[PDB]
Each structure stands twice: as C-alpha cells, then as structure tokens.
Design a protein around this ligand. Structure first.
Ligand SMILES: [Cl-]
Ligand SMILES: [Cl-]
Ligand SMILES: [Cl-]
Ligand SMILES: [Cl-]
Ligand SMILES: [Cl-]
Ligand SMILES: [Cl-]
Ligand SMILES: [Cl-]
Ligand SMILES: [Cl-]
Ligand SMILES: [Cl-]
Ligand SMILES: [Cl-]
Ligand SMILES: [Cl-]
Ligand SMILES: [Cl-]
Ligand SMILES: [Cl-]
Ligand SMILES: [Cl-]
Ligand SMILES: [Cl-]
Ligand SMILES: [Cl-]
Ligand SMILES: [Cl-]
Ligand SMILES: [Cl-]
Ligand SMILES: [Cl-]
Ligand SMILES: [Cl-]
Ligand SMILES: [Cl-]
Ligand SMILES: [Cl-]
Ligand SMILES: [Cl-]
Ligand SMILES: [Cl-]
Ligand SMILES: [Cl-]
Ligand SMILES: [Cl-]
Ligand SMILES: [Cl-]
Ligand SMILES: [Cl-]
Ligand SMILES: [Mg+2]
Ligand SMILES: [Mg+2]
Ligand SMILES: [Mg+2]
Ligand SMILES: [Mg+2]
Ligand SMILES: [Mg+2]
Ligand SMILES: [Mg+2]
Ligand SMILES: [Mg+2]
Ligand SMILES: [Mg+2]
Ligand SMILES: [Mg+2]
Ligand SMILES: [Mg+2]
Ligand SMILES: [Mg+2]
Ligand SMILES: [Mg+2]
Ligand SMILES: [Mg+2]
Ligand SMILES: [Mg+2]
Ligand SMILES: [Mg+2]
Ligand SMILES: [Mg+2]
Ligand SMILES: [Mg+2]
Ligand SMILES: [Mg+2]
Ligand SMILES: [Mg+2]
Ligand SMILES: [Mg+2]
Ligand SMILES: [Mg+2]
Ligand SMILES: [Mg+2]
Ligand SMILES: [Mg+2]
Ligand SMILES: [Mg+2]
Ligand SMILES: [Mg+2]
Ligand SMILES: [Mg+2]
Ligand SMILES: [Mg+2]
Ligand SMILES: [Mg+2]
Ligand SMILES: [Mg+2]
Ligand SMILES: [Mg+2]
Ligand SMILES: [Mg+2]
Ligand SMILES: [Mg+2]
Ligand SMILES: [Mg+2]
Ligand SMILES: [Mg+2]
Ligand SMILES: [Mg+2]
Ligand SMILES: [Mg+2]
Ligand SMILES: [Mg+2]
Ligand SMILES: [Mg+2]
Ligand SMILES: [Mg+2]
Ligand SMILES: [Mg+2]
Ligand SMILES: [Mg+2]
Ligand SMILES: [Mg+2]
Ligand SMILES: [Mg+2]
Ligand SMILES: [Mg+2]
Lengths: 174, 174, 174, 174, 174, 174
C-alpha cells in the first residue's frame, strides 16, 4: 500500500496502463520471434526474412525493458502477465508475415496513443514526453517500413511468385 | 502432415519434447526478467543484482532460440505456447531471489535430463549430443554458481543484514 | 594377426564399420566432384554451383582422412576398397543435383547412425563421441542447407526456369 | 550427511568413482615425475626424455584438478587418499620408460572406461559428456603417441643402442 | 550426340584418352593416400613419410581436376569410372613405398607420353601444349625426386636399418 | 653401489635427508591442494581462498622439483615414497585453514633447519648455500604472510563472522 518515496504526479491509472503496455511489447516480441523461425523452416528457407523478424523481436524486448525501467523510475510497481502465444503458427508467406507485422505495429501504436491520451488527461507531461520520445516516432517509422515492404512484395508478384519473395529477401532484407 | 525433406531419425515424441523445452527456456527468461526489475525498484535498489538477473534473462532467450533452430534443423515444427508469468511479483530479498533462481535452474535441468532420457530411448545420438554440448554443462555451472551465491549471502547474514546484500552486490556481482 | 599395442575397447566389428565408412566418404567426395564439373560444362555454365559442389567434394575427402586417422588412433587397420563411380554422368539441372546431394547426405547420415548404434552396442564411448563430435551435427547442417536450397530452387521455378537457376547461382551460391 | 544444494542426478557410486579417479590421475602424475628425473641423472642424461615426462606429469596434475572441480560442481565431496609411489625407482632405459608409460596410460584409460560404464548405468549424461569431452580422446591420443614412440625406439635399435636413444631424444622429443 | 558449341580440332579419341587419364590421376591420388596412412600406423610411425605421401595425394587430385577442366574447355564430356583400390594394403617399409611411388609415377608418365603421341597424331597443338606445360616436366621432376629418395634410403641401409628410415624421415622429409 | 662420477663432498646422510625433504614438499603440495578445493565447495564458496591455496600448492610442487634436480646435480639418487593424504578432509573455515597452513609451514621450516644442521655437520657448504638461497627465506616469508592472515581474520571476527571471511577473501586474497 504505502507510497513509493519517489512517486510524484503519477496516476494509478497510468501505472496500470504501463503494465498493460509492457505485456503488449513482450507479446510483439513473441510474434516476431515466431515469424522469424517460420522463415528458417527448410520448406520456407528465406534467411533474410528470418533475420529481419529476429531483429524486430529483439527490439520489442528492448521496448518492454525500457517501460519496466520507467515504471520503477516513477515509483509504480511492475505486474507481469502471461505473454500470449501468437495467433498463427504458420505465417503462410513473406507477404502475409509482413501484412501481419504491419497490423501488429498499428495495434501497438493504437495502444501507445491511448496511453498518451491517458497521460494527457492526467496532466503527466513527463509520461507524455516519454512516450513521444521513445515510442511514437519509432512506431511511425516501423509502420512506414512495413507498408513499403508490403507494397514491394505485392508489386513484385508475391505471394504466388516464389521468385519475388526470394529476390526481396536478397535485395531489400539482405 | 507430409514429411519434412530433412527429417531423419527424429521421433515425434522428441519433436514435442523440444517444443516443451522451448517454452520452459522462455519461461526461465521471464522469471529472470522479473527478478531483474525487482532489484531496480527504488525500495530495493541493488543494481548489480539487477544486471546479473538481466544477463541471465537474455541468456535464457538465447537458449530458447537455439532450440528453435534445432527443431527446424531436424525437420520438426515449432509450436509455441503462452509464456506463463512468474510465480512471484515481489522477490523479497537478494537471498530469496537467488534461492528461487537455484530452484528454477534445477527444474530446467530436470527437464533437460528427461529430454536426454527420451533421446536416448529413441536412439537419437544427434539430439543427445546437442543437449550434452549446449545445455547440460551450462546447467551444472549455473547451478554451482547460484549455490555459491546463496552460500555467501547466508554466511554474510542475509536476508536480515541489508549490509550483507549491499556488499555482495558490490563485491560478487559487481 | 597379433594385436596392436594401442588397441583397447575397439571391437573388430567397429574396425570393419569404420573401413566401410571411409569408402562411403570417398564415394561422397566423388559424387560431388562429378556434380561440380557438370556445372562447368559450356552447356550448363553455372559457375557457383560448380564451386559449391567442389568445396563439398573437398570436405568429404577431409571426412575420409579423419576416419583413416581414427582407425590408426584406435589400432585398427585400414582396408581400402574401389571408390565406385557416381550413379549419374549428367546431373540434369541445378535442382536435380541438389536433390541428389540431399539424398546422398541422408544416406551418409544413415550409415553414421548405424555406426553409432554399433559403437553404442559395443560400449565404445570414445567412438560414440567421435562420431557425435565430428560427424553427426555436420550431417544435420548439410542436410538442412541442401533442403533449404531445394526449397528455394523449387519456389523460384526450377528446373524449367533457367532464369531461376541462374539467379540462385548468383545470390545464394555466389 | 545432509544433501548438497547443488546435487542432482549424481549417484553416490559415481561420486566414489570420481574420488578413485582423482587418486589415479595424481598417481599418474607421480609416475611421470619419477620418470622425468630418472632421465636427468648424470648416468642417463637424456634431457628431452626428462622434459617430455615432466610435461606429462604436469598434465596429469591438471587432469586431477579438473576432476576435483567436477566433484564440487556436482555436489559430491572430495576424499583424498595417499598417492602411492611408482613401481620403479630406476626406469632402465628410454624405451622401457616409454613402455611403462604406455601401460600406465592404458590402465588410466581402462579406469575411465569403467567410470563411463558406471555413468551410463546410472543415466548420468552430464558425467558421460564430461568424461568423453575432457578425458577419452586425450587418452586415445596419448596412447597412440606412446605407441609411436615405442615403435621408433624399437626400430632404431633401443635399448641396446645408446645412439638410438640419444638420437630419438634430439629428433622426436627435441 | 549433338556437338558442343565450343568444340574445335578435338578428336574423339583424345576426348576418351583424357577421360582415361582423369581416372589414372585419381588412382594415383588413392595410392598416395593409402601410403600416407600406412606411415601413420602405430607400428610404422614415420610421420614425415606420412605427410610427404599425403601432399603427393592432394597433388594428384589437383592434376585430375585440371584434366576435368580441360575436357570441358575443349567441349569433350567427362565420363568417370571406378577408382580402383591400390595394389597393396601394407607398404612394407619407407624404401618399398618410395619404390612403389617411383613405379607409379613412371606408369603415369608413360600414359601421358601415349596421350601426347595421340595428340600429335591428331594434330592437336593445344592439347600437346597442355600436356607439356602442366604435366610432363612435373612427372620428370617427381621421378627424379623419388629416384633420389630411393638412392638415399638404399645407401643408408634401408629397409633393414629402422635407424636409416627414421633419420631419412627427419632429415629429408622433415 | 658404484659411485656417481659427479659425486663430491656429498654425504650419504645428506642424500637421504634430501629424499625425505622431497617427500615433505610433495606432502605440502598435497595439503594445499586439498585446502584449495575445500574453498571451492558450494557450501564454502570462497573463491580467492581457493586460488590462494592452489597457488601455494603449485609452489610446493616446484620446491620438490628443485630438490630432485639438486639430488641429481650432486650425484645422489632419488627415492620416492608415498605422498600421505592430508590430516583433514574438511578444513572448517578460512581461519582454520590458514592456521593449519601456518603450522604446516613451520613444520617444513623445522625440517629444512634440521637439514641445514646436517649439511653444516658434514661440512657441505654447497648444500648449506642451496638451502639458504632457495628455501630458508622463502619459509620465513611464507610464515610471516600466514601469520599476518591469521591475525587479520581473527581481528575481523572469524571464524564466527561469515562476513569477515567473505571480506578477507575479496580484499586480501583478491
Ligand atoms: Cl503520485
Ligand atoms: Cl492516483
Ligand atoms: Cl496472467
Ligand atoms: Cl524520422
Ligand atoms: Cl536480381
Ligand atoms: Cl524421422
Ligand atoms: Cl515418430
Ligand atoms: Cl498456450
Ligand atoms: Cl566446466
Ligand atoms: Cl567492503
Ligand atoms: Cl572494494
Ligand atoms: Cl580391443
Ligand atoms: Cl573384437
Ligand atoms: Cl574393392
Ligand atoms: Cl548447429
Ligand atoms: Cl543426486
Ligand atoms: Cl545415490
Ligand atoms: Cl589413504
Ligand atoms: Cl584427435
Ligand atoms: Cl638435426
Ligand atoms: Cl572437333
Ligand atoms: Cl573426332
Ligand atoms: Cl567403372
Ligand atoms: Cl625443372
Ligand atoms: Cl661424496
Ligand atoms: Cl658418505
Ligand atoms: Cl612408501
Ligand atoms: Cl625478504
Ligand atoms: Mg494487452
Ligand atoms: Mg536456416
Ligand atoms: Mg521495430
Ligand atoms: Mg514496441
Ligand atoms: Mg490461448
Ligand atoms: Mg495476420
Ligand atoms: Mg524524437
Ligand atoms: Mg512447460
Ligand atoms: Mg536503477
Ligand atoms: Mg545462465
Ligand atoms: Mg536455459
Ligand atoms: Mg496464470
Ligand atoms: Mg521461489
Ligand atoms: Mg562441453
Ligand atoms: Mg559402402
Ligand atoms: Mg568454367
Ligand atoms: Mg559438406
Ligand atoms: Mg562426409
Ligand atoms: Mg560399376
Ligand atoms: Mg539423384
Ligand atoms: Mg552418449
Ligand atoms: Mg559439436
Ligand atoms: Mg586407485
Ligand atoms: Mg640435467
Ligand atoms: Mg599426456
Ligand atoms: Mg590423466
Ligand atoms: Mg607401498
Ligand atoms: Mg613398467
Ligand atoms: Mg572432443
Ligand atoms: Mg586407367
Ligand atoms: Mg600419427
Ligand atoms: Mg607429385
Ligand atoms: Mg599426376
Ligand atoms: Mg579389384
Ligand atoms: Mg609396389
Ligand atoms: Mg611441340
Ligand atoms: Mg614448363
Ligand atoms: Mg617425511
Ligand atoms: Mg568454484
Ligand atoms: Mg608458498
Ligand atoms: Mg616448500
Ligand atoms: Mg594413512
Ligand atoms: Mg590443522
Ligand atoms: Mg636470498
């Protein structure tokens, strides 16, 4: 119960929202992990898709860690939840994985936007700045990159052209 | 259904057991993550406990990844499950965290030993070698290190001596 | 007849099996040699297929040499046999060569697995360790790589697309 | 009585066997020590035989130390015994010393093989791996080297040719 | 049937003769391989004989490869045959191995001379130049070196003097 | 029986005394070896005590070797005896180990002093100089260091303070 000695201008609702966001970032890490190893299957075998999604997975773990650090910086208390498995076991194709990643990042961005709204409603400028500085532009860039990737794959003839996915793997992700 | 072109001498039971082990390693990663940020709380404030457990968390993620790679190398199919949250939100003390980590690593080791027994019963020497080479000695070393740590903390007067935990933090984990 | 001064715990059946395995490795070297120069024909002209299979040929000669060294280390006696010519003179296509290499490596792996079973039945842990350390994972990696290659070529449109085989030659084997 | 906190899957019989093996390695160290200084006598005066056996003596002390470390890693308890003096005070000749070293290393290897059998019967894969990784191939190489040395000395005309032992000292051990 | 686009002034008899010569070079590689590991036996133990013959074995594999490349350069088609095992399993002595190698190289040289005669009869100056440039002087040098070696071993008292073979191993092959 | 060609002014009693001293130095090496691994136990876990005593163990082996060399330099003949196991299996504490080491080094010093008395009574100045140069001051320094260590541990509150032994381990032995 008793307060943290550091706590100031940090609403309990913001504290809870940061714990939800921690879960979401870990969930995103897990989705990209799954995607990565899909492309490492002997019957998929797109090694640069695999590295690309692994890198993205590790990023998301870093995003979670920074929110954990924030929780403590502000005197909130971290409460972890189960990290749900991804929706898919088999991601179908390079294009479909990229489409799923785009939708994931748009979902994560919507959560961060709700979090910023809350921080604004509770007049927490430090939390607003945090989210702006470390998260919002990183989402806009990720979203733009994924859209670019989907566009290229589509134009190249994916998913039906295995050639298209192979060449994208070498030229864009390589 | 249809076979993987790479698959040879890889029993379905071993395939399932590797998927269980993947979950366990990710679970271990999550426990150490939680422990790490506990020591980063302003009311705990043992920064080298925090770094030590974070490093251990990242290790475990690497151990999971290597099993995922193995699954694919052998032509098995990765099936992920929810990563359960840790048993504890509050780890009490440096000593109690170390005790919990020891029990975690002994549990992980017991799983790997059951996995090796299975691999032996199914006459899978490649899988036996894998487990021996990449996992079993790494467990024995982790277990020994954690026991050493618990011993020192106990001898120093933890958990009642906050001095003991502070000095261990600086001299052993620092 | 009279024993080797070094010989210990080395069954005559293991000695014979190692001589068979020596022949098999040299045979594998010969198959890859043949494949290599097929891709060097003026009417095939895929120079990176050619280098890839030449490298694999030299590897296999090294694998044979290490078994010869082992035979002597254990006090067995090397008995060489004719190295049979490969099954094919003309390997048809990049894809078909890769398919044949996959089947070759799976055959070599099955032989090594039978050899390990024998070594296990004769309670020869040094020989078990030898095979595990120097051979079994090297087979699993070769098999996985070849499967990956076959998958890519298939997805790209080989063997009918001469473009697919040309581009694979440059991007994967180059 | 009470258990070690680290102990897992480590049979008391294996614990005792490791203590016996520790004694044997120290015993081997002592035999090579004695051999070394024999060749340093003014009436023997083969300085490279002396260095060769001293190096081998120090190796064996390292092999003992690694088993001591293992005992502790696994939660067993080290119990030392007297290190018996070697069988011989006077080793007769370079050839006879080499012959005695060959028989010593074959004895040490037989002990390690019995130890591996025990570890296998008690389903201790970590201990099996330990012995395989750190000991069994090191014995096979030592045995092969000693056999090679005995062969050369014999072919050269030792022990009757003092010239043979002198020249072996310079060309093989030098 | 249909011609190679590159083929010019390349008689079918020369094409067949190059395929025979390819087999012979691989056969020579195999003989030297066998010789090499004979000297690696614990009861022979002449390590520089072993390295010398291994080097010669690898050379011969290179000589085969260059003929394979030639076949393709000229638009002929490679047809491989079984590589026969060597005549001997046990090479008796350093001197006898050297004598056998001399006879092998003289046989290989006689084949190359017949090949040059054919190339001359078919007015193939490119093939004549090939053989002259890459093979004939390399044979004359190998033959001279082997004769020199046999002479020295004979003068030193081989094969009865095990000392002679030991010292030759160190001073000439070392 | 017959004399060594090198022997001069070297009494048989001195020869025997050097053989006794060789045994004592090896015995000291063994005591420190045992002490070392005691501190490596998971329930003791003082790693710098362990390194300190291991270093001391290796020193003593060097002291033995130098006496063996001396025996031969003077034309005496080395006669080895069993190296007795240490008095203790369990050394109780850092302080008690240090106390036992102090008593060991004082015993070794008393032996060397008796040896010097003998060398003096037999008018062997070379042996007197040997002992003075290589041994006596090395004992006085070891004794002083061990006394210093015991003093510090005692003042710090050992053996009851596990904190004291931990901090000594880091600051003095570290
Ligand atoms: Cl607040
Ligand atoms: Cl609030
Ligand atoms: Cl939950
Ligand atoms: Cl930007
Ligand atoms: Cl391209
Ligand atoms: Cl299977
Ligand atoms: Cl199955
Ligand atoms: Cl689940
Ligand atoms: Cl280790
Ligand atoms: Cl301090
Ligand atoms: Cl300090
Ligand atoms: Cl045997
Ligand atoms: Cl047998
Ligand atoms: Cl045959
Ligand atoms: Cl691997
Ligand atoms: Cl146990
Ligand atoms: Cl037991
Ligand atoms: Cl005893
Ligand atoms: Cl080896
Ligand atoms: Cl010389
Ligand atoms: Cl023509
Ligand atoms: Cl023609
Ligand atoms: Cl044939
Ligand atoms: Cl010349
Ligand atoms: Cl005298
Ligand atoms: Cl006297
Ligand atoms: Cl005795
Ligand atoms: Cl001084
Ligand atoms: Mg959520
Ligand atoms: Mg891969
Ligand atoms: Mg990202
Ligand atoms: Mg994120
Ligand atoms: Mg669910
Ligand atoms: Mg989706
Ligand atoms: Mg910014
Ligand atoms: Mg589980
Ligand atoms: Mg902090
Ligand atoms: Mg770890
Ligand atoms: Mg793990
Ligand atoms: Mg739950
Ligand atoms: Mg717990
Ligand atoms: Mg290992
Ligand atoms: Mg065969
Ligand atoms: Mg070419
Ligand atoms: Mg290969
Ligand atoms: Mg092979
Ligand atoms: Mg045939
Ligand atoms: Mg085929
Ligand atoms: Mg095994
Ligand atoms: Mg390995
Ligand atoms: Mg014994
Ligand atoms: Mg000397
Ligand atoms: Mg050795
Ligand atoms: Mg040893
Ligand atoms: Mg006795
Ligand atoms: Mg003997
Ligand atoms: Mg090894
Ligand atoms: Mg022929
Ligand atoms: Mg050798
Ligand atoms: Mg040559
Ligand atoms: Mg040739
Ligand atoms: Mg035949
Ligand atoms: Mg012959
Ligand atoms: Mg001409
Ligand atoms: Mg020339
Ligand atoms: Mg004594
Ligand atoms: Mg330790
Ligand atoms: Mg000392
Ligand atoms: Mg001493
Ligand atoms: Mg006793
Ligand atoms: Mg004592
Ligand atoms: Mg002095």
């Amino acid at each position: 119960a008793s307060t943290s000695q550091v706590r100031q201008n940090y609403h309990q609702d913001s504290e809870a929202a940061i714990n939800r966001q921690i879960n979401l970032e870990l969930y995103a890490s897990y989705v990209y992990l799954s995607m990565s190893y899909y492309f490492d299957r002997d019957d998929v075998a797109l090694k640069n898709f695999a590295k690309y999604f692994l890198h993205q997975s590790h990023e998301e773990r870093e995003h979670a860690e920074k929110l954990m650090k924030l929780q403590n910086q502000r005197g909130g208390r971290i409460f972890l939840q189960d990290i749900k498995k991804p929706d898919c076991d088999d991601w179908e194709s390079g294009l479909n994985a990229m489409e799923c990643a785009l939708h994931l990042e748009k979902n994560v961005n919507q959560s961060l936007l709700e979090l910023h709204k809350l921080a604004t409603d509770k007049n927490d400028p430090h939390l607003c700045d945090f989210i702006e500085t470390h998260y919002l532009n990183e989402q806009v860039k990720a979203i733009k990159e994924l859209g670019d990737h989907v566009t290229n794959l589509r134009k190249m003839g994916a998913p039906e052209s295995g050639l298209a996915e192979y060449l994208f793997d070498k030229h864009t992700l390589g």
